[PDB]
Amino acid sequence: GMGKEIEIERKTLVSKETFKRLISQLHIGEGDFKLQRNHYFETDDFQLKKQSSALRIREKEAIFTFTLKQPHPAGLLETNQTLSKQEAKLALESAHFPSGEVMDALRDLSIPISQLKHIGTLSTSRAEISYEQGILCLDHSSYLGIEDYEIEFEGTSEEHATVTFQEILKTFSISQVPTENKIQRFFSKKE
């Protein structure tokens, strides 16, 4: 919707060689990959994690986006807000966030905004294609000295997303493995 959206997502990590094979078989060019930086925010005691939520500022092609992800009956509720470079920099450098729908949703979750701070940055090189009735993302990410590769399917219903993703794993012979979110893979490494 207009700032808010429901995220229905299926995901698995893959090897470097499998990722490289998928780029070839899906006929994805080098120029299709776009670079983005995810700057993560969290309290010392990890309050957003305890409420199954994630707060980031994304930087992509000179556009900054403030994003909260929180639990929702179906999938996760994603609340997006555009920021200027000024607002993004203030948040990153001095933990001063702008008023708006993201701030409102944080305060509705009883998150002390004065305790939030920039914990680190994960970079992702991403290619996206329309697959069936959804979107298929190829993510090569780097963070805290290491890197990894990931395929994800963005669906519209939980039922159809499962069917479509299981079809992708079978069709392209991808062996599925347990896969937590980028932000969780980030600070599980940080810990």
Q: Which residues bind Cl ion (CB under 5 A)?
A: 123, 125, 142
Q: How far is the CB of 148 from Cl ion (least distance, A)?
A: 10
Give least dist CB 171 to Cl ion, A. 26
Of 142 and 166, the one with the shorter C-beta distance to Cl ion is: 142
Residue closer to Cl ion (CB basis): 67 or 123: 123
Kindly tell me which of 65 and 125 has the beta carbon lying closer to Cl ion. 125
Shortest reach from residue 125's CB to Cl ion, in Å: 4
Answer positive or negative: Cα dihedral of 18, 21, 26, 27.
positive
Vertex 78, ends 132 and 80: CA angle to 5°? Answer: 110
- Pick the closer one to Cl ion by CB: 80 or 123: 123
Q: How far is the CB of 37 from Cl ion (least distance, A)?
A: 9
**Nearest distance, CB of residue 90 and Cl ion, angstroms:** 26
Please say which residue, 22 or 76, places its beta carbon nearer to Cl ion.
22
Q: Which residue is nearest to Cl ion (CB)?
A: 142
